[PDB]
Ligand binder design. Sequence first.
Ligand code: GDP
Ligand code: GDP
Lengths: 153, 427, 427, 36
Amino acid sequence: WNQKVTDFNRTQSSSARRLERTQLTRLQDNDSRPIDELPSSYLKPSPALLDLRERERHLVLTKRYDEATALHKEGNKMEKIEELEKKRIFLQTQKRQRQQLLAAQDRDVAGFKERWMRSADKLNQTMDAEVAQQQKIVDNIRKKLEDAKKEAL
Amino acid sequence: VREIVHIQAGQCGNQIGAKFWEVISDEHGIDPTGSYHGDSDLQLERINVYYNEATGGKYVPRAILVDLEPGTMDSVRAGQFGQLFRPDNFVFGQSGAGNNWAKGYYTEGQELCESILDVIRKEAESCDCLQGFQLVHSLGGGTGAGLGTLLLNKLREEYPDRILSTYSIVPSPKVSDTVVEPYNCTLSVHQLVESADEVFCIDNEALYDICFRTLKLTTPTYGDLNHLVSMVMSGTTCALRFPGQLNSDLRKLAVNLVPFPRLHFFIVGFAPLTSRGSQQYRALTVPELTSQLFDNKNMMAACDPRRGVYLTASAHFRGRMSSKEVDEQMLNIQARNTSYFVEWIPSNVKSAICDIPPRGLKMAATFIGNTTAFRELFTRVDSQFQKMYARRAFIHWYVNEGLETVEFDEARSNMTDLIQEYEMYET
Amino acid sequence: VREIVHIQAGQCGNQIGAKFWEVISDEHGIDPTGSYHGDSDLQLERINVYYNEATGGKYVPRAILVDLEPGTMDSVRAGQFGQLFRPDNFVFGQSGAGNNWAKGYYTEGQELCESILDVIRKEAESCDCLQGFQLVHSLGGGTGAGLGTLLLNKLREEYPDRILSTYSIVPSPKVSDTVVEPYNCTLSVHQLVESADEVFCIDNEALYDICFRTLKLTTPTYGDLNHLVSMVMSGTTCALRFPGQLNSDLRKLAVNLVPFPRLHFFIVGFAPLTSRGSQQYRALTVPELTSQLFDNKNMMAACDPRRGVYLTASAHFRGRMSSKEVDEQMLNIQARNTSYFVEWIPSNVKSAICDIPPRGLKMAATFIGNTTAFRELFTRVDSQFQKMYARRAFIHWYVNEGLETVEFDEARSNMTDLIQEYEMYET
Amino acid sequence: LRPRVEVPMSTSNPNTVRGTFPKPNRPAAQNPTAEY
Ligand SMILES: Nc1nc2c(ncn2[C@@H]2O[C@H](COP(=O)(O)OP(=O)(O)O)[C@@H](O)[C@H]2O)c(=O)[nH]1
Ligand SMILES: Nc1nc2c(ncn2[C@@H]2O[C@H](COP(=O)(O)OP(=O)(O)O)[C@@H](O)[C@H]2O)c(=O)[nH]1
């Protein structure tokens, strides 16, 4: 039965850190992906920005250039305020997702052990029953042998 | 106590929703002003799924109606059913729809999005439990395709566990109501694949064909065409609202019919449908129902299953009926036409029975199926999209709103890989 | 026997004060002639909190009205309840206000300061005990902001132990009724921070937003706006006047809500405010009040709590109600939105229950909260002040009265430090 | 003699990005051959 513990240990040790290497694998990749870029979907401008550059088009096309300079000044100003915001929102969302993904790996580890503690509990239960019976029977015979001896010594 | 929140987007959604709320209000015996004038106690057992109660004996639907232009909404108000809905659940913009997917998604959709979400927060967090949400929209338009998908992403972010069932109308292949449809249909499907758990596809052509073939209507208006759609929407949730011999709600339906997360586009069909004059002569029984359901002509989506194979199929039965008679048909219809089911999944037909039928009918049955015949639907739109995209000028309407041409490539590629995936599980 | 002395300053104070006594007199049951004609014994229990009794069954409020020009005083007396006040508590000057803080504080204030204190003295020392004073004034003006703060210093020196609760109206961000508010409000805060115990901030635009959003008033007038504020002043002192299952008077409020001596600016809100049509859809439940109070739209000050974090919060409930139901809502609302509360203070929501509700309503609630979001409203006036200060703007009017230029620099520095102090405790 | 539980290991912002707003439609001509 002591040999069964070794087979228990090798099965547990191989399976435990098979999961642990895999648990790091998905965390290794997603945690160091491109963060210094705003993808295409995040670059969409506000509708208020559309009219300013639409009205700036006609100011240029009508050959009214003095007034076109003012709107270009306000257009670039209104981009900088809006560019900073979507950088913050993407960085806020990007930070959350890795936190959200990371917390899922450890929950599976918590459930991973529950499958292994109880399996050892059943193994420990069968461990105790057989040796106790073997010691119970042999001790009685050892007691019985001395009981017959007690008639003489 | 498995509450469902209902959302209607655009012109197509409101007209479907308006007809839909008549059907259930009749089923539960509810007056249009909101009072129960009903005929039995069993209608009040689990009415909480769809209606909220206002002190005074009035029942208010868990509905939010969404539009970009106020024209559609006022048709609901001026209509017969214009008092039932809560006033605060009408949220509308003051800009044209544009009939444009990009403009609705990015330009006007953002402004309405935060206003919409808080209304849902009022409805979503008002009930003890919440099984899922329900959205009705069309894919060819601009508001339902553009703003409808935007809301579907946010709802997934906030309520990941809940079932986001959607009923969608796909652009027709022969004659269609909008020119820019291949651009609107392609971009919407990319969003729908990764977001919604379940999608039901409905085509207007089959409804014209079904009414003209079976119901023998000479002049089918949208009133009767939407009536066929509303029967499917009520039939799916009938297990929640009434007792029965064997229950099966949405999450049972999603578990059984969906073998992989991406293959979840469904076709629907309803039986019995019989001519208004021929109904007297018809001996409607359990075996008769199955003949109509699996018949290719009763499919509400124009995708002939005989050109593909079935992966999973589900049938819902309503009314007092034999469980033995129901079970035998699932054997026979699966065994008689073995060329139309996948071999590596035995028992492809799911079944369920509900106690209480809809009004007028002693027994009725509903069919939901997933098949590789859907490759037909997406092949048509991709070819038309490719035909138009070869001349990038129409894209200028979408570029002036901010959409980049790469997003067309991303959407088409994701749709293409879905088609190839259906092909390879056919073997 | 916890008497309170009431002081009103300027145009804003008298008109808010005049409506305030219409609310209380109807609540207690006092005919506008000053006589008791009530319906319950509980009303005569603790009328001594606010009233004195002249021999004959005539009750006189403990009110003192302060102004520099008697224009608004005479508009009050022509009103229905103007006869109630004692004629000798009307203290006024004979010179224009000037809408100038330095003019109110130094030139006309010193002349009036001599007489006003003795009128305060008669009412402060005619009662068996005195818990604190009650001030109503606006900060954008020159009479309420200037002379109101000067009396605040004298009251603190003479009566240090007593609670000097003040109610203030903050200048609005979009449209504001005075050019020189940045000078007036910046100086006024310097006096309010060091002398007052409790300060409540009300913004006029939020009052407009509530009236148009919730009550659907097509034309809200200053009678309706002042009506909303009266409920909060009525609500806070209700624990003194009527029995309750869990009492919480002014001094309990300050100890629990105020963690540090300088952070005591508060925001308020009142529920239920019911739309004139939405009522038939609204069932009054204990949860229904809780949703309204913590809703950001209901807040009476136009600084968004979501942009900051809460330090303490308090909810007052009025009527006969379950004590379990109130206590549960505090735990649920705290745990559901943990992102807006500070970690190093658990159980951030204080609660109380009072037995007698306002007339017509079987249940009502009041909210008082403290948050870092007040950093928004100080930065606004600091930004406006510096621009008017960088070039010498209207300053020459204040310097001529005798105010030194170093008083502004002390005023801005102290105001700036309170902005940093909110920032530091956010971590 | 007895089984043993094995302890497994647990696996538990700058705004400098490169993107910019998209390409707009522009009014200036691009045909110098017939314009210059
Ligand atoms: N079946 C059905 N289809 C409809 C109904 N109303 C509109 N549609 C379809 O919706 C499509 C376009 O809808 P649209 O007006 O663009 O709505 P939008 O999404 O808000 O822009 C058209 O192909 C119509 O056939 C209806 O009541 N029933
Ligand atoms: N809520 C409310 N605010 C008022 C009323 N009357 C004036 N105000 C506000 O009080 C602020 C300053 O008033 P002001 O005339 O300077 O009062 P003063 O202190 O006597 O000089 C202005 O911004 C007004 O908007 C009123 O009846 N109700």
